[PDB]
């Protein structure tokens, strides 16, 4: 049946099921409700920078359907919602004046979400940094960040926390480190070779415990000011690909665990144990900031759940560790990608060149990590695949291959829960097709389909397939 015995009986009572959105990928308005620019606005208006040169001006244009977008997801049985709130949509200039426009929209999503029995998740940043504060800070190459953030997170707090009682930080501090600072495809675009500076061996190092400190900074403000009266959460999301080693010899087995620890453990080893993981502070010395004891204090137990964004796996191939002149965060790894085994590729590509569809991954990650780590708690904040540009609205609607992809990510997710992994929801990356970062319109992950000419919602086959598997 083509639930494959999947419904809510099989995962554990009061399990939370939602979609994900993220502010500047659905809102629109990019620059109207008196939102200032954030550094994707710069960058995504820069010819070349994004495919077809496109921008989330637009975007879905949730800003003004957004009840439209709640009835439907409400229609689809999920319990949850997670978005993002725009820093600059909030203080457009990320400090001082705050814009009382921005604050409105989020109080009536919010409160419209809470009214149809939809639970807000908040990020309160996803990419979106305004675009004021790299202008006169330098962003997050700056320290300084974690007072910045801890005020924006404070208001959000005060403002917002008598009714949001699931927050994030933070989404794929990882991403941003290696995209913004490593390779400099992302803004603020920095590496060793980039026209705007920087150093893709000291940078995304900096970049990530400024992330941290944040993180921390902002938790302790929550926990201090608002929880006792709130009485609600606070986590982060993480990315975590897993890494599987091509064969059981040990160089490759060793090599598996470096591409784990620099991946996740990166995050997590400072989240959880209060330290980078051995292997960075190895490999990486002085190039590694060093957390002073009241730091590592701070950041150690610092969120109440760790999301993990799950999408795909690798296999890796090691080598002898080598002496090596620094080069970026990537190289410091020394493991070598592989993407078939034994003849056989590790699976197949969705629309997007990295995502291989392969879900024992979903499974390798969350073991891991109970393993690992303490079995924290653990929310699955995306997991999902992309359509191609240019089909007809019938073909993205037939989305035969991503009703497959739920099925055999959620049978390995339940495999993990049974054996004992304490993972409280999972969340579809994305409720909507939307704006997706280079890829522009060209990449399509919703599970309901958006014409970007007329704006029109249409939910695609895998929206009933949650419907129907998550019927009360
Ligand atoms: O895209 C959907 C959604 O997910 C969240 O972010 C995505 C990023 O959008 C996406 O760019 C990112 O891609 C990673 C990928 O996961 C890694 O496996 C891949 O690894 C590289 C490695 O860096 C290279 O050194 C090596 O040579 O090859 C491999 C490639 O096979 O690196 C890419 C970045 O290039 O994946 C994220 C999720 O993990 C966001 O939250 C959401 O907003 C996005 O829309
Ligand atoms: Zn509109």
Redesign the pocket.
């Known amino acids: 049946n083509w639930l494959g015995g999947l419904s809510r009986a099989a995962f554990p009572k009061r399990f939370v099921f939602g979609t ?1 959105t ?1 502010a500047y ?1 659905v809102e629109g308005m990019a620059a109207s409700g008196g939102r200032g620019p954030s550094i994707w606005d710069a960058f995504a208006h820069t010819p070349g920078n994004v495919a077809g040169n496109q921008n989330g001006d637009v975007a879905t244009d949730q800003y003004h359907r957004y009840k439209e977008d709640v009835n439907l997801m409400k229609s689809l049985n999920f319990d949850a919602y997670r978005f993002s709130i725009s820093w600059s949509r909030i203080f457009p200039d990320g400090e001082g004046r705050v814009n009382q426009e921005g604050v409105a929209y989020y109080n009536n999503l919010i409160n419209y979400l809470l009214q149809k029995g939809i639970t807000p998740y908040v990020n309160l940043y ?2 979106d940094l305004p675009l004021a504060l790299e202008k006169k800070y330098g962003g997050w190459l700056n320290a300084k960040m974690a007072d910045l953030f801890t005020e924006y997170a404070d208001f959000c707090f005060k403002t917002f926390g008598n009714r949001v009682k699931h927050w994030f930080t933070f ?2 501090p990882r ?1 941003v480190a ?2 913004g600072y490593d ?1 400099g ?1 992302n803004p603020p675009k920095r590496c060793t070779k980039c026209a705007a500076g920087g150093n893709s061996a000291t940078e995304p190092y900096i970049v990530a415990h400024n992330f941290l400190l944040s993180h921390a900074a902002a938790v302790a403000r929550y926990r201090t000011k608002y929880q006792a009266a709130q009485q609600g959460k606070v986590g982060i ?1 993480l ?3 897993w890494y599987e080693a091509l064969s059981n010899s040990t160089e490759d087995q060793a090599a598996a665990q470096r591409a784990r620890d620099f991946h996740i453990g990166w995050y997590l080893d400072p989240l959880i144990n209060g330290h980078y993981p051995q292997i960075m502070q190895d490999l990486v010395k002085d190039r590694l900031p060093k957390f002073t004891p009241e730091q590592a204090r701070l950041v150690k137990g610092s969120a109440d759940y760790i999301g993990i ?4 796996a ?1 296999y890796m191939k090691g080598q002898q560790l080598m002496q090596q002149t620094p080069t970026s965060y ?1 190289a410091d790894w020394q493991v070598t ?1 592989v ?1 078939a085994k034994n003849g056989k590729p590790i699976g197949p590509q969705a629309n ?5 569809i392969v879900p024992w991954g979903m499974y390798g990650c969350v073991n891991y990590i109970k393993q690992k780590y303490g079995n924290p708690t653990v929310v699955i904040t ?1 997991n ?1 695949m ?1 359509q191609p540009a240019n089909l007809s609205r019938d073909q993205y609607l037939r989305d035969t291959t991503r009703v497959h992809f739920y099925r055999s990510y959620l049978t390995q997710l339940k495999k993990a829960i049974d054996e004992g992994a304490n993972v409280a929801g999972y969340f579809a ?2 409720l909507l097709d ?1 704006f ?4 522009g319109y060209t ?1 399509k ?1 919703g599970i309901v389909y958006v014409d970007f000419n007329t704006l029109e919602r249409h939910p695609k086959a895998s929206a009933y397939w949650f419907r129907d598997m998550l019927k009360h």
């Open positions: 994900v993220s990928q996803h990419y989404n794929q991403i290696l995209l390779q495809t999301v990315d975590f690909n964004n799950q999408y795909t690798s990537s990608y993407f997007s060149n990295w995502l291989y995306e999902g992309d990356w994305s939307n997706e970062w280079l890829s990449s992950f």
